[PDB]
């Protein structure tokens, strides 16, 4: 349908006249992750490719009007791509190639609101800095570049991988976290530019 056309292109384009960023395709130019179990494994990967986040569902919506706080619990099936370097800085390693992932993730964001009038009257949901913590990432499906995945073999000593060794603990798990909260820093700054615009009647 003609909708259809003008929805992927705001989800891919974005709408800079509104300053709305775009969410799907949503490129991150570089982004290095810290495996939360031992800072001498860096994942630095660049050129990041995430698409799904167009189907993501706000599966549930909580508000404290005390608090003047927002809950929005996250469901979206992403597919993630890009190159990646594995930096064992304690064993003086670097690993090269290519990485993706498919999984659905669970996520629940956390805002603060403040309420204000703009210059005619208009009353607006000001969007506070928001949280975003990773609650599932299901049991993920994640790919290497052969060069890479034999090179990790070799330096294993191991025909076959641990997934659950590190680093692919991390890649199977945090490093998807990480990239998801970047994913999310654009939806929620995508709600906090169309709250200015909107008012706060808009539910």
């Not at 597919?79 to 594995?86: A, L, R």
């Amino acid at each position: 349908s003609s909708a259809t056309e003008q929805f992927l292109e705001k989800t891919s384009k974005g709408i800079p006249q509104y300053d709305i960023w775009p969410i799907d395709p949503l490129v991150v130019t570089s982004l290095d992750v810290i495996a939360p179990s031992d800072a001498g494994i860096v994942i630095r990967f660049k050129n990041l490719n995430i698409t799904g986040l167009k189907n993501q569902q706000i599966s549930d919506f909580q508000m404290d009007t005390k608090a003047k706080t927002v809950l929005l619990k996250t469901k979206a099936d992403l597919h993630i791509v890009g190159d990646i370097v594995i930096e064992l800085t304690e064993q003086s390693k670097s690993f090269t190639g290519l990485y993706t992932a498919d999984t659905n993730v669970i996520g629940a964001v956390r805002y603060g609101y403040n309420l204000k009038n703009d210059d005619n009257g208009v009353q607006h949901f000001e969007v506070q800095p928001e949280t975003f913590t990773c609650e599932s990432i299901g049991e993920p499906k994640i790919t290497l570049s052969s060069d890479l995945s034999s090179a990790l073999e070799k330096d294993s000593g191991n025909n076959s991988l641990e997934p659950d060794m590190e680093p692919l603990k991390t890649l199977r798990q945090a490093a998807i976290c990480k990239i998801a909260e970047a994913c999310y820093i654009s939806v929620v700054h995508n709600i906090r530019a169309s709250a200015k615009i909107l008012p706060a009647s808009s539910f």
